[PDB]
């Protein structure tokens, strides 16, 4: 870290007033409970000692009952000024911190984002590094003066009332403070392994849904519901050891608390007998020391957060004051009257300042004629990506000069130079703002007329009107994700608005289809006229339109000519041979109601009924654990009553008895606290395992189209099965154990209260809920109010994360201050809410603490009123008060019930909607026609019409009639694919045809059950798909009982035995993300070998393109030959040599098949057709 006192470097006039008030109001609040104890110790004394004079009893109890109404008013006005003046004086600082961080973070030169700090590291420093700082100066500095003043004032009132009893308590506190620290560390040692064991076993569902296409293609989907259950037991046996360590950490805290009070009370009963101590002063000292002695554990997080908030604050202050390395505010920058578009480059040598050894630019000399179309054509890595940055002057040249009308770049003003240059990037840059503000970045002062003119030139105003909101259409989280062509058109319109004289087209349409580029190119051509423009094209059509073509080679200009001059030198030149890898880059890449939320509880708690022997031995340990929080507060008051008896002989006999219950029935709290938390952790841990695999057995049952709804992504079913299944643990088992535990407490408190005096046990019950409601707020104060810091600043941070990441586009235009202005204005709406939240949470806590102490001035006065009128006395009216008022601080365990308590039916609806989801394709359909033995295997199709269910508009198949012969070959080929593969999907019944018939040996496939017809199809996916397990169990994923010889045969036939046996481990070699990575030409081999383990009659060899190894294919072709040896093979390929041995070759284009036959039959009727003309396109 940097230092303390450096975090408060953004303070202003109000930040020395809010901290100067929230430090006095938090110090007065801290020293108010150890003073209420002092007042209580004096009220009781003048309430039992003056039994012979009721008259003095009444003016000396009313006074101390009116002091309570002042102690409770000094907390209403002292908790308001602490909770509200600390959450606001941190919000006023951590906002000016973030504004400065962003303003000085995109001011840095682009070298900074590569040489020193990654572009993804900075976005982290706003998400978390600006939250760790705020939480350690707003809410955790105020919880430090409070818990230090409480500790300081916990000894002044203790050692000055009865010092001889305040030392025994000091000799006791460091025992509770050690047991309660060991228990909270043993729990953390076990709460960090369950997550590991649930995320190592929770990746099975992550992997399964990604490759559901091959998981469902084979029947091995029952191998994913038992490799997912046998990996949950690891997190279940470990989930049983958390309950035991939670019960033996609460049965040992009470075993110490009872014993220590079994000695403090005896010593207090010894002091009183010898006349050194009052009756109440021996009680408000044990409490006052233990309150001020345990007030250091709550001061541990406050100092633990002061260390993280400096190692997380040094990074921000590093960037904030770091001066850049280029003189941006260039007052020493020359100016030019009017440019003519003349650019010269002479002897420019440059290298990246990340590996200063390459020579990307060597002895570069190039002249840019004014008003002409100079195009850059070359291979990857031969330049055309550094010269564009150098004219923009992103990196200053290492050695060399660039002349723009005869003056050096290091001599003009940077902001003016970047004003006359128009840059169009290959990705459009849009920020979280409206369409209108996304174009004003070009120039601020433009009116609406010019913007609309530019938009209608940009082929943009056509769909602007079609958009509902028009120019105010908010692009960002909303905005329906407009198309890439439209995205490019907005940026192009922004470029026209700037109206530059020099234009840099760097890969304008390098990643769009021919439809959008058709619209874009003509607009660029209209915007081309009258401008010195340098185009880096990707298609030869624009190069044909280019005036000059200067081809770089190894960073130097090699070939200079035109479109026609360069092509005249034949294939021997680079210009003609560039077509081969130019045109190949296109085809290859292409709400409650008590009836809906009652079934959710009740249907859930019916399948959780094989375990009633464990939910019935947890309602006993919850009753004799709630009957001991009332047999302790009752003894703690029955000792106070006997302190005032004038007969010392009788007083000892009762102190002895009550010191033998707190020692005796302490083992009954040690034992019965390991039956409540150790038997409610078996009921609540087997329900989750049963509900986490009922969903998987249903997610593995939906239709193939259900996974293409764009809501069922890869890691979002895995998130629903891991975040909506951990909230069911706290719904049944963890809430019956709190209702019963607290029902068994108010039945032992209100019995011992009603037996003695029923006129006081009725009044105290009437104001009983306002005591527990006030005490719960005393435990939701330690964690802190206004949590969840990062989600409040989640709308503005999108602008930061999309603006600093696209720093090049931000700095190309001079919009480095017009984004700070947009980022400041999106932080005030949270700043007008975090203040009212602080006021509300301050007032609602102040009033709920005044109304608590106002209820201690109504019981203690009514007792004194009863005593005068001869109804009761001090003995009976002080047990009723103390029992009923301490079994409300002992009744505040409703805070400690894994306090979720509200996700409830909100999370429970998703679980039961997934279970109750129907499937229109039955995976295993009973009452079905029977499946024969080894069949003929003759696939036939009849008038097939088909389209994707997601897009039912484009009918791809239109009366598709095709028949696979009796096991010979049905090679399907054709150009313009992406839809040819639908025959593969139709046969495995992934999708349902719109209209048609699928005959297998002359029979419809809907009459067959789905899980047996798949015992005869062998699928080979195009993309190498091997699961994260060793080689042995990837090949074995195609059968049931695979012997060693069978797998060895499968490996040998696919030519995989040699390589696998050549590996170090052998068949046991581990493959996957966390292991060995192999070559794709071999990963296809393993897939083919897996295919020949089924011994199927129908083989669906999908395309194996995007891989070339002639020696590998020399064996792969014959491996396919015996893979096609008398078996019905429908092969879809791209290379015509692979279909030379095909018996039936079908050409499928424009949705129909017309050219069918073999090599001899097709070349006879179609000697000049597509099948014959595609041939010559390329020992």
The residues of the shown chain that bind ligand BLD, judged by CB under 6 A, are 40, 257, 287, 290-291, 882, 885-886, 889
> Nearer to ligand BLD by C-beta: 287 or 850?
287
Nearest distance, CB of residue 287 and ligand BLD, angstroms: 4
- What CA dihedral angle connects 880, 885, 887 and 889, to 10 degrees? -170
> Nearer to ligand BLD by C-beta: 772 or 1050?
772
State yes or no: 1068 annotated in a binding site.
Answer: no
Nearest distance, CB of residue 289 and ligand BLD, angstroms: 8
State yes or no: 735 annotated in a binding site.
Answer: no
Nearest distance, CB of residue 82 and ligand BLD, angstroms: 20
* Cβ atoms of 864 and 58 closer than 8 Å: yes
* Cβ atoms of 1145 and 1171 closer than 8 Å: yes
| Of 464, 460, 342, residue with least CA distance to 407 | 342
State yes or no: 903 annotated in a binding site.
Answer: no
* Cβ atoms of 457 and 496 closer than 8 Å: yes
DSSP letter assigned to residue 866: H
DSSP calls for 778-837: TTTTTS-SS--HHHHTSSHHHHHHHHTTTHHHHHHTT-SSTTHHHHHTTSHHHHTTHHHH
> Nearer to ligand BLD by C-beta: 566 or 885?
885
> Nearer to ligand BLD by C-beta: 424 or 891?
891
Take residue 169 and report the two structure tokens written for it.
């308590």
> Nearer to ligand BLD by C-beta: 22 or 247?
247
Other C-beta atoms lying within 10 Å of the C-beta of residue 1032: 17
Nearest distance, CB of residue 871 and ligand BLD, angstroms: 21
Nearest distance, CB of residue 291 and ligand BLD, angstroms: 5
State yes or no: 893 annotated in a binding site.
Answer: yes
> Nearer to ligand BLD by C-beta: 81 or 860?
860
1149: left (phi over 0), alpha (psi -120 to 50) or beta: beta
DSSP letter assigned to residue 695: T
Collapsing DSSP to helix, strand or coil, 1076 comes out as: strand
State yes or no: 228 annotated in a binding site.
Answer: no
Nearest distance, CB of residue 885 and ligand BLD, angstroms: 3
State yes or no: 352 annotated in a binding site.
Answer: yes
Nearest distance, CB of residue 610 and ligand BLD, angstroms: 36
**H/E element holding 424?**
strand 421-424
Separation of alpha carbons 520 and 985, rounded Å: 36
State yes or no: 222 annotated in a binding site.
Answer: no
Nearest distance, CB of residue 96 and ligand BLD, angstroms: 42
| Of 507, 564, 530, 498, residue with least CA distance to 372 | 530
Nearest distance, CB of residue 247 and ligand BLD, angstroms: 16
> Nearer to ligand BLD by C-beta: 423 or 633?
633
> Nearer to ligand BLD by C-beta: 291 or 1130?
291
> Nearer to ligand BLD by C-beta: 315 or 876?
876
Cβ-Cβ contacts under 8 Å for 723 (sequence gap 6 or more): none
- Residue 1123's alpha-carbon distances to 5, 1001, 1020, 1098, 1101, in angstroms, are 76, 21, 11, 10, 10
Residues of the chain by 3-state class (helix, strand, coil), percent to 5: 50, 10, 40
**What's the number of CA atoms in the CB half-sphere (13 Å) around residue 283?**
24
Cβ-Cβ contacts under 8 Å for 437 (sequence gap 6 or more): 822
> Nearer to ligand BLD by C-beta: 219 or 289?
289
| Of 506, 452, 515, 510, residue with least CA distance to 486 | 515
Nearest distance, CB of residue 58 and ligand BLD, angstroms: 19
> Nearer to ligand BLD by C-beta: 265 or 1148?
265
Cβ-Cβ contacts under 8 Å for 165 (sequence gap 6 or more): 264, 267, 268, 271, 277, 282, 285, 286
> Nearer to ligand BLD by C-beta: 264 or 501?
264
Give the E-state strand segments of 947-1021 in sequence order: 957-963, 972-973, 995-1000, 1017-1020
State yes or no: 261 annotated in a binding site.
Answer: yes
DSSP letter assigned to residue 113: H
Nearest distance, CB of residue 201 and ligand BLD, angstroms: 37
| Overall size of the chain counted in residues | 1179
State yes or no: 385 annotated in a binding site.
Answer: yes
State yes or no: 240 annotated in a binding site.
Answer: no
Nearest distance, CB of residue 290 and ligand BLD, angstroms: 3
> Nearer to ligand BLD by C-beta: 244 or 256?
256
State yes or no: 562 annotated in a binding site.
Answer: no
* Cβ atoms of 520 and 512 closer than 8 Å: yes
- What CA dihedral angle connects 992, 994, 997 and 1003, to 10 degrees? 30
From edge to edge, which strands make up the β-sheet containing 1145-1149?
972-973, 1145-1149, 1152-1157
State yes or no: 386 annotated in a binding site.
Answer: yes
State yes or no: 1058 annotated in a binding site.
Answer: no
DSSP calls for 296-341: TGGGHHHHHHHHHHHHTTHHHHHHHT---SS--S-SS-B--S---S
State yes or no: 383 annotated in a binding site.
Answer: yes
| Of 575, 470, 586, 646, residue with least CA distance to 51 | 646
State yes or no: 951 annotated in a binding site.
Answer: yes
Separation of alpha carbons 635 and 637, rounded Å: 5
> Nearer to ligand BLD by C-beta: 197 or 253?
253
Nearest distance, CB of residue 159 and ligand BLD, angstroms: 17
> Nearer to ligand BLD by C-beta: 161 or 1146?
161
Nearest distance, CB of residue 164 and ligand BLD, angstroms: 19
Nearest distance, CB of residue 882 and ligand BLD, angstroms: 6
Indicate the pairing of strand 1098-1101 with strand 1128-1131.
parallel
Q: Which residues are annotated as a binding site?
A: 114, 261, 352, 354-355, 383-386, 708, 856, 893, 948, 951, 979-981
Q: Which residues are annotated as a binding site for ATP?
A: 114, 352, 354-355, 383-386, 708, 948, 951, 979-981
Q: Which residues are annotated as a binding site for brassinolide?
A: 261, 856, 893
């Amino acid at each position: 870290g940097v230092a303390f006192k450096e975090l408060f470097r953004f303070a202003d006039g109000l930040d020395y007033v809010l901290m100067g008030i929230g430090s006095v109001g938090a110090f007065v609040h801290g020293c108010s409970l150890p003073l209420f104890l002092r007042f209580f110790a004096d009220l009781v004394n003048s309430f039992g000692s003056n039994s012979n004079n009721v008259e003095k009893m009444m003016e000396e109890v009313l006074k101390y009952a009116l002091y309570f109404l002042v102690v409770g008013a000094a907390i209403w006005a002292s908790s308001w000024a602490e909770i509200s003046c600390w959450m606001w004086s941190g919000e006023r600082q951590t906002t000016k911190m973030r504004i400065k961080y962003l303003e000085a973070a995109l001011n840095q030169d682009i070298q900074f984002f590569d040489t020193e700090v990654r572009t993804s590291d900075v976005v982290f420093a706003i998400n978390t590094d600006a939250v760790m700082v705020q939480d350690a100066i707003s809410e955790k500095l105020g919880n430090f003066i409070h818990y230090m003043a409480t500790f300081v004032s916990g000894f002044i009132v203790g050692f000055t009332a009865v010092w001889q009893l305040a030392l025994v308590t000091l000799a006791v506190v460091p025992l509770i403070a050690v047991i309660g620290g060991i228990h909270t560390t043993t729990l953390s040692k076990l709460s960090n392994k369950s997550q590991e064991s649930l995320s190592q076993a929770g990746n099975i569902v992550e992997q399964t849904v990604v490759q559901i296409r091959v998981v469902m293609a084979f029947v091995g989907e029952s191998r994913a519901s038992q490799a997912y259950s046998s990996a949950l037991k690891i997190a279940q046996k470990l989930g049983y050891k958390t309950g035991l360590a939670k019960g033996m950490g609460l049965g040992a805290t009470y075993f110490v608390v009872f014993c220590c009070y079994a000695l403090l009370l005896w010593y207090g009963g010894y002091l009183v007998r010898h006349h050194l101590t009052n009756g109440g002063l021996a009680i408000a000292t044990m409490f006052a020391v233990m309150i001020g002695g345990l007030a250091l554990g709550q001061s541990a997080p406050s100092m633990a957060a002061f260390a993280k908030a400096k190692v997380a604050a040094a990074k921000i202050f590093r960037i904030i004051d770091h001066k850049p390395t280029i003189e941006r505010n260039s007052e020493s920058g020359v100016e030019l009257d009017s440019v003519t578009g003349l650019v010269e480059l002479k002897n420019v040598d440059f290298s990246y300042p990340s590996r200063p050894d390459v020579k990307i630019l060597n002895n570069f000399c190039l002249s840019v004629p004014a008003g002409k179309t100079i195009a850059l054509v070359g291979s990857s890595g031969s330049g055309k990506s550094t010269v564009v940055s150098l004219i923009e002057r992103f990196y200053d040249p290492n050695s060399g000069q660039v002349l723009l009308d005869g003056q050096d770049l290091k001599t003009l003003k940077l902001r003016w130079l970047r004003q006359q240059i128009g840059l169009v990037s290959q990705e459009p840059a849009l920020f979280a703002t409206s369409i209108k503000e996304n174009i004003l970045l070009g120039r601020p002062d433009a009116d609406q007329v010019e913007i609309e003119e530019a938009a209608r030139v940009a082929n943009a105003h056509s769909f602007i009107i079609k958009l509902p909101d028009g120019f105010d259409t908010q692009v960002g989280e909303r905005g329906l994700q407009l198309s890439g062509g439209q995205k490019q058109r907005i940026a192009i319109a922004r470029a026209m608005l700037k109206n530059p004289a020099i234009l840099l087209l760097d890969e304008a349409t390098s990643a769009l289809d021919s439809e959008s580029e058709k619209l874009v190119q003509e607009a660029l051509d209209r915007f081309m006229i009258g401008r010195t423009t340098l185009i880096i094209a990707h298609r030869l059509s624009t190069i044909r339109k280019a005036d000059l073509v200067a081809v770089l080679q190894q960073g130097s200009v090699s070939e200079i000519g035109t479109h026609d001059e360069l092509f005249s030198k034949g294939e021997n030149g680079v210009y003609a041979k560039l077509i081969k890898m130019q045109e190949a880059a296109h085809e290859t890449a292409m709400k409650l109601a008590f009836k809906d939320q009652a079934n959710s509880f009740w249907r859930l708690a019916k399948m959780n009924s094989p375990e009633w022997k464990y939910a019935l031995l947890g309602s006993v340990g919850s009753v004799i654990c709630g009957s001991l929080s009332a047999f302790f507060a009752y003894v703690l008051s029955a000792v106070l009553s006997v302190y005032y008896n004038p007969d010392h002989e009788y007083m000892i006999k009762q102190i002895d008895k009550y010191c033998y219950l707190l020692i005796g029935l302490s083992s009954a709290a040690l034992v019965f606290n390991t039956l409540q938390h150790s038997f409610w952790d078996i009921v609540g841990e087997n329900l989750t395992k049963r509900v986490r695999e009922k969903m998987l057995s249903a997610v593995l049952k939906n239709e193939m189209a259900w996974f293409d709804q764009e809501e069922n992504e890869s890691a979002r079913i895995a998130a629903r099965l891991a975040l909506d299944a951990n909230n069911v643990r706290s719904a049944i088992g963890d809430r019956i154990s709190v209702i019963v535990q607290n029902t068994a407490l108010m039945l032992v408190a209100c019995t011992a209260g009603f037996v003695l005096q029923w006129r006081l046990a009725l009044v105290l019950v009437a104001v009983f809920p306002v005591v527990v409601a006030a005490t719960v707020l005393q435990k939701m104060f330690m964690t802190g109010f206004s949590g969840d810091l990062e989600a409040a600043h989640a709308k503005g941070t999108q602008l930061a994360g999309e603006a600093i990441a696209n720093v090049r586009t931000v700095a190309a235009f001079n919009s480095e201050a017009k984004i700070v202005r947009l980022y400041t204005a999106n932080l005030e709406p949270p700043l007008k809410r975090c203040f009212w939240k602080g006021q509300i949470a301050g007032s609602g806590y102040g009033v709920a603490q005044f109304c608590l102490y106002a209820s201690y001035a109504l019981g203690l006065w009514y007792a004194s009123w009863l005593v005068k009128h001869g109804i009761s006395d001090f003995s009976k009216t002080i047990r009723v008060f103390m029992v009923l008022m301490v079994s409300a601080n002992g009744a505040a365990e409703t805070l400690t019930l894994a306090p979720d308590f509200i996700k409830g039916g909100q999370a429970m609806r998703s679980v039961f909607e997934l279970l109750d989801r129907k499937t229109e394709i039955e995976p295993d359909d009973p009452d079905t026609t029977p499946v024969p033995d080894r069949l003929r295997g003759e696939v036939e199709l009849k008038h097939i019409d088909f389209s994707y269910p997601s897009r039912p508009d484009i009918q791809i198949f239109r009366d598709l009639s095709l028949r696979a012969r009796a096991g010979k070959t049905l090679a399907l080929v054709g150009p313009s694919g992406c839809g040819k593969s639908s025959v593969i999907s139709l046969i495995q019944r992934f999708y349902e045809p719109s209209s048609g018939r699928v005959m297998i040996d002359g029979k419809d496939i809907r009459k067959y059950n789905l899980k047996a017809i798949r015992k005869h199809i062998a699928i080979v996916p195009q993309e190498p798909c091997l699961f994260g397990t060793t080689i042995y169990e990837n090949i074995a994923y195609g059968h049931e009982c695979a012997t060693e010889a069978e797998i060895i045969q499968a490996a040998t036939l696919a030519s995989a035995h040699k390589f696998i046996s050549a590996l170090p481990e052998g068949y046991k070699t581990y493959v996957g993300e966390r292991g060995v990575q192999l070559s794709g030409g071999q990963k296809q081999r393993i897939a083919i070998a897996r295919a020949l383990v089924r011994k199927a009659e129908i083989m669906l060899l999908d395309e194996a393109t995007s891989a070339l190894d002639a020696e590998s294919e020399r064996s792969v072709q014959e491996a396919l030959d015996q893979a096609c040896s008398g078996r019905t093979s429908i092969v879809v390929a791209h290379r015509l040599s692979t279909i030379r041995n095909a018996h039936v070759i079908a050409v499928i284009d424009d949705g129909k098949v017309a050219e069918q036959g073999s090599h001899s039959h097709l070349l006879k009727n179609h000697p000049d057709g597509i099948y014959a003309r595609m041939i010559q396109l390329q020992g």
